[PDB]
Design an enzyme around this catalytic site. Structure first.
Site, PDB file in Angstrom:
ATOM      1  CG  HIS A  85       0.084   1.208  10.222  1.00  0.00           C
ATOM      2  ND1 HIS A  85       0.497   0.507   9.121  1.00  0.00           N
ATOM      3  CD2 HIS A  85       0.093   0.325  11.246  1.00  0.00           C
ATOM      4  CE1 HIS A  85       0.817  -0.727   9.459  1.00  0.00           C
ATOM      5  NE2 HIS A  85       0.549  -0.877  10.744  1.00  0.00           N
ATOM      6  CG  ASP A 126       0.606   1.689  14.647  1.00  0.00           C
ATOM      7  OD1 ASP A 126       1.824   1.349  14.728  1.00  0.00           O
ATOM      8  OD2 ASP A 126      -0.321   0.863  14.353  1.00  0.00           O
ATOM      9  CG  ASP A 243      -0.846  -3.793  16.585  1.00  0.00           C
ATOM     10  OD1 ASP A 243      -1.560  -2.968  15.961  1.00  0.00           O
ATOM     11  OD2 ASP A 243       0.370  -3.862  16.428  1.00  0.00           O
ATOM     12  CD  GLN A 294      -5.177 -11.166   5.391  1.00  0.00           C
ATOM     13  OE1 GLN A 294      -5.497 -11.281   6.571  1.00  0.00           O
ATOM     14  NE2 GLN A 294      -4.261 -10.330   5.003  1.00  0.00           N
ATOM     15  CG  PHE A 297      -1.566 -12.486   8.863  1.00  0.00           C
ATOM     16  CD1 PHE A 297      -0.365 -12.183   9.526  1.00  0.00           C
ATOM     17  CD2 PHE A 297      -2.693 -11.723   9.136  1.00  0.00           C
ATOM     18  CE1 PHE A 297      -0.303 -11.181  10.469  1.00  0.00           C
ATOM     19  CE2 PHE A 297      -2.643 -10.702  10.074  1.00  0.00           C
ATOM     20  CZ  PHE A 297      -1.448 -10.436  10.736  1.00  0.00           C
TER      21      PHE A 297
HETATM   22  O1  LIG Z   1       4.386  -4.264   7.825  1.00  0.00           O
HETATM   23  C1  LIG Z   1       5.159  -4.801   8.788  1.00  0.00           C
HETATM   24  O2  LIG Z   1       6.357  -4.936   8.586  1.00  0.00           O
HETATM   25  C2  LIG Z   1       4.620  -5.212  10.139  1.00  0.00           C
HETATM   26  C3  LIG Z   1       3.124  -5.483  10.044  1.00  0.00           C
HETATM   27  C4  LIG Z   1       2.651  -6.757   9.706  1.00  0.00           C
HETATM   28  C5  LIG Z   1       1.268  -7.018   9.708  1.00  0.00           C
HETATM   29  C6  LIG Z   1       0.358  -5.998  10.067  1.00  0.00           C
HETATM   30  N1  LIG Z   1      -0.997  -6.211   9.972  1.00  0.00           N
HETATM   31  C7  LIG Z   1      -1.487  -7.094   9.079  1.00  0.00           C
HETATM   32  N2  LIG Z   1      -0.659  -7.850   8.311  1.00  0.00           N
HETATM   33  C8  LIG Z   1      -1.174  -8.735   7.409  1.00  0.00           C
HETATM   34  C9  LIG Z   1      -0.335  -9.514   6.663  1.00  0.00           C
HETATM   35  C10 LIG Z   1      -0.859 -10.430   5.762  1.00  0.00           C
HETATM   36  C11 LIG Z   1      -0.001 -11.222   5.005  1.00  0.00           C
HETATM   37  C12 LIG Z   1       1.373 -11.088   5.145  1.00  0.00           C
HETATM   38  C13 LIG Z   1       1.892 -10.165   6.049  1.00  0.00           C
HETATM   39 CL1  LIG Z   1       3.679  -9.952   6.212  1.00  0.00          CL
HETATM   40  C14 LIG Z   1       1.034  -9.389   6.813  1.00  0.00           C
HETATM   41  N3  LIG Z   1      -2.532  -8.862   7.270  1.00  0.00           N
HETATM   42  C15 LIG Z   1      -3.350  -8.100   8.036  1.00  0.00           C
HETATM   43  C16 LIG Z   1      -4.813  -8.229   7.934  1.00  0.00           C
HETATM   44  C17 LIG Z   1      -5.449  -8.173   9.310  1.00  0.00           C
HETATM   45  C18 LIG Z   1      -5.692  -7.039   8.315  1.00  0.00           C
HETATM   46  N4  LIG Z   1      -2.823  -7.198   8.923  1.00  0.00           N
HETATM   47  C19 LIG Z   1       0.841  -4.737  10.416  1.00  0.00           C
HETATM   48  C20 LIG Z   1       2.214  -4.483  10.418  1.00  0.00           C
HETATM   49 MG   LIG Z   2       3.026  -0.609  14.832  1.00  0.00          MG
HETATM   50 ZN   LIG Z   3      -0.903  -1.043  15.210  1.00  0.00          ZN
END
Ligand SMILES: O=C(O)Cc1ccc(Nc2nc(-c3cccc(Cl)c3)nc(C3CC3)n2)cc1
Ligand SMILES: [Mg+2]
Ligand SMILES: [Zn+2]
Ligand code: NA
Length: 344
Positions: A85, A126, A243, A294, A297
């Site tokens: 971020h 962000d 995002d 992933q 996700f």
């Molecule tokens: O951290 C948070 O609470 C909100 C959040 C969740 C996901 C993201 N982005 C993200 N989040 C994940 C991810 C993967 C697995 C599990 C979870 Cl909870 C999130 N993976 C990726 C890959 C695309 C780069 N990106 C950003 C903020």
């Molecule tokens: Mg954000």
């Molecule tokens: Zn963002």
């Protein structure tokens, strides 16, 4: 000074930067290279390029000097030591939002002010991110969670910082907007950044499904949106899609993004551990399984979102969808032989 005039940033490699920016209107732009050739000011560079490309500085009478001053302090308010971020992520969401605004099914649907709001929202969405999640801030009884009553804590913060920066001397890029434009822009930007709160993901998605279920198009495939309420609902999903766009980019880019998000999660996990808290899902480097997460996700969050957006604008996002499936297949193949963060 001429390359600042051309790029909004200092660069030792004007030619390389300019070649990277030839992909400005494409999903395949490589924002890591743009950072490389811009002394690591990707957000200032990409925002200046976006505002020049769309004539936004002319249309809204925004001074380019004031713009650069604002964007430099905005970019400085992203933290270099936060692994995901930071200002590179903001740049990417802003460039991705810029591409989504040109999807042919949305041609001429939005006002200029809506276009400006969405790109500006992306850029600030962000800012001043501390590298820990809302839930962490809530669990540690942080000042931000106290200030914002546990509701979209970081997102409120990003907005407040973004807007406060406009009141710094020499930074008010919207000075020449009329009062009504400033009011409308402000409301739309607030709306869109608050929509990036992941815990609103499922409600946004449901709303978007209603909009797909009820969609109608002209005989040229352009979406027909009836009122402000329909348009803001598309724009808030658009920014949310940008995002969550990392898995819809080329695999070489996506993997870089995943390395970054995991470092950030692991650093939070270390904080949690240093202070004897239970380590959050995904944040424990000892037990993490990057590939499987992933795949999860994508299957549960990213794919359902993008499949619906793709349905809304069909056929314009089919290739983005194909890439997302292909990437899912790659991560699946590399598994060695969540949901509450996106709900309520
Ligand atoms: O951290 C948070 O609470 C909100 C959040 C969740 C996901 C993201 N982005 C993200 N989040 C994940 C991810 C993967 C697995 C599990 C979870 Cl909870 C999130 N993976 C990726 C890959 C695309 C780069 N990106 C950003 C903020
Ligand atoms: Mg954000
Ligand atoms: Zn963002
Ligand atoms: Na900084």
């Amino acid at each position: 000074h001429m390359s600042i005039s051309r790029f909004g940033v200092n660069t030792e490699n004007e030619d390389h930067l300019a070649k990277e920016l030839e992909d400005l209107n494409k999903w395949g732009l490589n924002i890591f290279n743009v950072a490389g050739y811009s002394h690591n000011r990707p957000l200032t560079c990409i925002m200046y390029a976006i505002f020049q490309e769309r004539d936004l500085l002319k249309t809204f009478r925004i001074s380019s000097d004031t713009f650069i001053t604002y964007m430099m302090t905005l970019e400085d308010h992203y933290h270099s030591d936060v692994a995901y971020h930071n200002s590179l992520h903001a740049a990417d969401v802003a460039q991705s939002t810029h591409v989504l605004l040109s999807t042919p099914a949305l041609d001429a649907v939005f006002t200029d002010l809506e276009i400006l709001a969405a790109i500006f929202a992306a850029a600030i969405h962000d800012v001043d991110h501390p590298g820990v999640s809302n839930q962490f801030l809530i669990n540690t009884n942080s000042e931000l969670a106290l200030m914002y009553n546990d509701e979209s804590v970081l997102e409120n913060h990003h907005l407040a910082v973004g807007f406060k920066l406009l009141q710094e001397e020499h930074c008010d890029i919207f000075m020449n907007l009329t009062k009504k434009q400033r009011q409308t822009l402000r409301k739309m930007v607030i709306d869109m950044v608050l929509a990036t709160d992941m815990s609103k993901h499922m409600s946004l998605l449901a709303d978007l499904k209603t909009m797909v279920e009820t969609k109608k198009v002209t005989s040229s495939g352009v979406l027909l949106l009836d009122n402000y309420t329909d348009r803001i609902q598309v724009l808030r999903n658009m920014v949310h899609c940008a995002d969550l766009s990392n898995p819809t980019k080329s695999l070489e880019l996506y993997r870089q993004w995943t390395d970054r998000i995991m470092e950030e999660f692991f650093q939070q996990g270390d904080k949690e551990r240093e202070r004897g808290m239970e380590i959050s899902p995904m944040c424990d480097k000892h037990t993490a399984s990057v590939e499987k997460s992933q795949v999860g996700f994508i299957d549960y969050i990213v794919h359902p979102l993008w499949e619906t957006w793709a349905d809304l604008v069909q056929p314009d996002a089919q290739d983005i969808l194909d890439t997302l499936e292909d990437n899912r297949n790659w991560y699946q193949s590399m598994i060695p032989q969540l949901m509450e963060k996106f709900q309520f």
